């Protein structure tokens, strides 16, 4: 038992390791999306920059959870980072839709983590999730929804013009 | 065939995808090491900072190879990022030794990549490797060797004093 | 024999004179394209500026090879600069496609020059080509491919709107 | 007929295309001279810089005439740029004499262009030539004459000392 | 075997020790030349400064190769630095000619070192030589050739005036 | 006889040439020591920096004596610079002891040079030695003695910790 450990359930510790993996996974999905838009036959530079920024953010999310694990005296166990479910993300609209789906999955995982913390009467963990993760997820989901809506209304993905102009005026 | 592709062998393209994976793997190993030294029962903050810096560097290495793949008209295929071979890195000396071994493995992979590029008469790829990777590897290996030597001479890993003082005066 | 000449094969010297001519030729093609977009019945000012910049760059490429010839003790022999294969470049998309083709031809010439240097065991010439020409060509080809892709996806050349908006938001 | 064309005779348009070619030719002659003085067995760096500056100026002359052609609604037709009449320019004095001869030939062409413009009652073209070309030519010819005179009086080309000192104190 | 050593042939290691000695030797030759021009019966202060600068440069060349040896895990073995082949360098022209000969000898040694590295499939060593030594040698040889040419054309070594004026206007 | 020579005995001139050689030799010993501490299996960076600084100082000592030789109208005759008596300097303490021995040998040579100058009634040479060399030697010897004392008291060379900490806190 860690000399610092206090009111930290083993289920919470395991859940934090799973969330670390999920955040690293999200980082990897976004990296893949980013360089898809860097392809010479896609060539939407601001889509690429947008998803690269997201990738680096998700890495920060993971590192803060690793720090949390050690803060509470839990022990980090890393697992493989699975490659994303696609190699070719099709279009700006499709990538944005996939990112929305991803962020809602991460959000669901965090809400389950919060539920667990509360069930185990761990207010420090509950508030850590509340303070550093829940509103970030709500903001990310809202932003992605906004982007999907505009791309759809503009005529994406069929209109290459639409994705070009969205890349310039929204993501640029 | 990509409209940009020229003098880029399919073996080179495959080799670049493998090197991307190896760089991401190195990034993950270093992340694991970093947070090992953040444990309350290890608590060497400058070892932790050193390996975290290395982790972020390796991520830059991977991203530059992904950019290269698209520059030459190859196609990125990501694979799982395997978890590191240890969860507990034992000591500062042991971690440094493991990092040395890792950098020499990455170096061997890059020398084979250069050999392939030269065999396929790809001077752009050969010089990309020469210019951006080979001396970086030699410098990294020399630095890690220096660190291992000093930690050994100081009495690590048995002397917790040695690793403490090395953390303060070399890594800090 | 020049007092400075050393390890410089006569075939390399001849090849450098041919590359000088090819760089001056590229400069001239780009000059022609530039002023095509300055026509009152074409009137895409940022296409014009883009190709004029390219023209001046190619002139720098030629001058650096002339300097190289004298550095190694070879002797410059200039040849006519052939007029470009078109007087009317049709459209922004068509010009970009022609520029892509041109840069790949120049690249092929440089890869053959590097192959020759290596065959004649001239590492100074090989590395001169590697360092100052090969990645510049890869970058130019990637950029032109990106531009072609976007113009195609936007609806060029049929959509005069597409080329107008690309001129404003990408080239401007 | 161009929508902008007004009071612009087809003979004037053709004459402007010929003058464009002559300006590009002058640029090429000066480029050749410049790198002749960069040879290790000539090695007069300020002669080289002087003629390189002249080369870039002549390119500006050509570009302004191309702009003029489009301003008036004429159509640019480029022709080959002939290689200069010498590969070896012999000496600083000889190069200066050849440049003087060249500038007087260009001047003669411009005076004929002005005569044509006036014959066709084209005061815009006449004044364009007057304002941007005629005094530039007179100044260039006077400067070259001054240089030839001094080099002759100093003992060039036989005195290598003379050309060395002129390179340092006049061209430097 | 050094813990850092990788893909570093014993022949390469020996060749690097020989090149270290040759660079120190060049430094010594230039030191000797420098103070020859400091003699009261020679008294060309800018020749003296020129060769002293060269001496210190060659020392930097040697130190970078010593660093390289340790970077690759080779072991430095120094040898005597032979005194130069002359005590009296005769004249500015003669010294410049001797320096040209010296730089071409050093260049030949470096080209053989590069050939060896390539034969032993050592791209890190090949590119180290390419990047830090080959163009430096080409530039040095061209500069010395230029100086020899001007001194000859001016009338050196018979004209003490020529060497005086060259010292003032080129080396000063 | 030099036009500047006055009250300068041939024995003094010869002695100055010997001292030039001894100063260059000291520079070389210190260069060797410096890069010994740059080895991956020694890796004391501040020992390396300390002896490199000493090497460059000794080179300044030699150059000032060469200047002196020409000031007095003597003639410089250089001799080989002998390689140092060791390739492997064992330890920080051992190197410091060897440097102390070296500086006392150089000092003995300078005291004999001063004795000679005084015997030949050469007060300019005597005071040159007094002013620029004797106290520098006393200071160097005292510093090296201080370093040896501290390294011994700390437990060097057996304590790798001692040399590490001395490198950090005294030489750094
Ligand atoms: Ca998998
Ligand atoms: Ca696995
Ligand atoms: Ca033709
Ligand atoms: Ca290279
Ligand atoms: Ca012709
Ligand atoms: Ca000898
Ligand atoms: Ca010896
Ligand atoms: Ca005194
Ligand atoms: Ni996010
Ligand atoms: Ni996240
Ligand atoms: Ni779903
Ligand atoms: Ni690294
Ligand atoms: Ni890496
Ligand atoms: Ni192993
Ligand atoms: Ni280009
Ligand atoms: Ni080019
Ligand atoms: Ni074709
Ligand atoms: Ni080869
Ligand atoms: Ni002119
Ligand atoms: Ni002109
Ligand atoms: Ni004539
Ligand atoms: Ni040099
Ligand atoms: Ni050198
Ligand atoms: Ni010879
Ligand atoms: Ni000293
Ligand atoms: Ni000394
Ligand atoms: Ni003794
Ligand atoms: Ni006395």
Short mmCIF file of C-alpha atoms and ligand atoms in Angstrom, two decimals, chain C residues 19 22-23 26-27 30 57-59 61-62 103 106 110 133 136-137, ligand 16:
data_model
loop_
_atom_site.label_atom_id
_atom_site.label_comp_id
_atom_site.label_asym_id
_atom_site.label_seq_id
_atom_site.Cartn_x
_atom_site.Cartn_y
_atom_site.Cartn_z
CA UNK C 19 20.97 21.46 -65.30
CA UNK C 22 16.96 23.37 -67.35
CA UNK C 23 16.66 25.71 -64.36
CA UNK C 26 11.86 26.50 -65.71
CA UNK C 27 12.29 30.17 -64.79
CA UNK C 30 6.97 30.35 -64.90
CA UNK C 57 13.22 31.12 -57.48
CA UNK C 58 14.22 29.08 -60.53
CA UNK C 59 16.63 31.81 -61.51
CA UNK C 61 18.48 27.70 -58.66
CA UNK C 62 20.38 28.31 -61.89
CA UNK C 103 8.84 20.16 -61.47
CA UNK C 106 13.39 18.87 -63.18
CA UNK C 110 18.36 16.08 -60.53
CA UNK C 133 17.88 20.60 -54.59
CA UNK C 136 13.17 21.65 -52.57
CA UNK C 137 11.81 19.57 -55.46
NI1 LIG G 16 14.61 24.67 -59.92
#
